[PDB]
Structures are given as C-alpha cells and as structure tokens.
Design a protein around this ligand. Structure first.
Ligand SMILES: [Mn+2]
Length: 199
C-alpha cells in the first residue's frame, strides 16, 4: 500500500535519524513528512500529543496515503535492513484494522509504545479526537497520547487494532539488545549525548 512515514523534531541525533528515515522512504517509494516547525503548545503533555496534530499535516500534504507511520525522532532505520520494505516485517492487508501498535514487555512501563505507530487513513478523524483530548483529564497525564490511544481509542474500536511484538518494528535498544541487529526500526527510548553517540 501507499505509506507515508511522518516524524518531527524542533540536534545531531535527530538530524541523523531524519536522514536515515528520509533515505529509507526514498529507497522504497514511501512519502516522507517531517514537521521541522516550532510547536505553539510547548508543555510536556502537549509535545507528546503533537504527533496527533502532525499526522493531520501529513494527510493534507499526502491525501492519497493508505497507511500513515509515525516514528519518534529517536527511532531510526537499521542500516542492515534499509533495503527491506515494511511489508516484509508486517501484514497490512486486513482492511478492518486501523491501528498497528507494539508492546514493550516486560521491560517497558506501559502496554503499548507509540514511538512507532501505524495509522490507517480511515483513522484520521480518530487522531483528530486524540489531539482534542490533550488538555482533558485523565488524558493530559503521563503517558499522554499513548494512554489516550490505549485507553480511550482502543475500547471504542474492538477488533480494529493489533498489538504486535516490538522486536523488529519498535526495538528499544536498551531493553532488547539481542534483537537490535535484526530489527528494522530501532528506538533509542531511555538522553541526547547518549543518542548522538549511538547515531
Ligand atoms: Mn521515543
């Protein structure tokens, strides 16, 4: 399908991850949207929610998109696998599914990690609602958009989401060091100097 990968960051590591993702899209014919812009709302919760505003900007630019893929700015493409398409790691053929998300068990603090998040075009209005909840309790409490997707969105869409193993597509470096080599998306979740050094 038509994939648009989107990300944003307003930083060496973040430029390097950008490059790799930008390169990866170019290799496979994916659209690339990057929010280089400065956020109007700069509080901690609002910055986490900003991904749900960015997707709306991505969709305006690329309206022919079937699947939107959010990647954090601390997620990069594993050089080893840069020549492999996304479809070689995940089945996006089920027309009923709106979200593909990934767990972080047992090292992670929450049932899903939205650092890598697949959103079907038919869920764009849902992402609009997530953005709108950014200043509403309990959604404005940590972990923010990630809590809102898991606890507000998912209950309303039974059967329309899959929570996947993270080993290839949301491979947190510190948590899964034995999986990093074979991963597609590597997530430097868990420090700028540390990230630059890694990049
Ligand atoms: Mn992250």
């Amino acid at each position: 399908p038509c994939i648009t990968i989107l990300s944003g960051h307003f930083t060496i590591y973040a430029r390097k991850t950008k490059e790799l993702v930008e390169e990866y899209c170019s290799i496979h014919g994916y659209n690339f949207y990057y929010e280089e812009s400065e956020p109007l709302e700069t509080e901690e919760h609002a910055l986490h929610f900003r991904r749900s505003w960015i997707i709306q900007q991505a969709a305006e630019k690329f309206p022919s998109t079937e699947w939107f893929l959010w990647l954090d700015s601390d997620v990069y493409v594993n050089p080893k696998n840069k020549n492999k398409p996304i479809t070689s790691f995940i089945d996006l053929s089920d027309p009923n599914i709106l979200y593909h998300t990934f767990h972080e068990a047992p090292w992670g603090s929450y049932p899903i990690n939205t650092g890598v998040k697949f959103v079907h075009k038919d869920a764009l209005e849902i992402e609009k609602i997530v953005w709108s909840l950014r200043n509403e309790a309990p959604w404005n409490t940590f972990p923010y958009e990630q809590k809102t997707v898991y606890e507000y969105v998912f209950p309303r869409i039974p059967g329309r989401y899959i929570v996947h193993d993270p080993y290839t597509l949301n491979c947190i470096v510190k948590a899964y060091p034995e999986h990093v080599k074979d991963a597609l998306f590597v997530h430097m979740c868990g420090s700028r100097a540390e990230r630059d050094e890694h990049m």
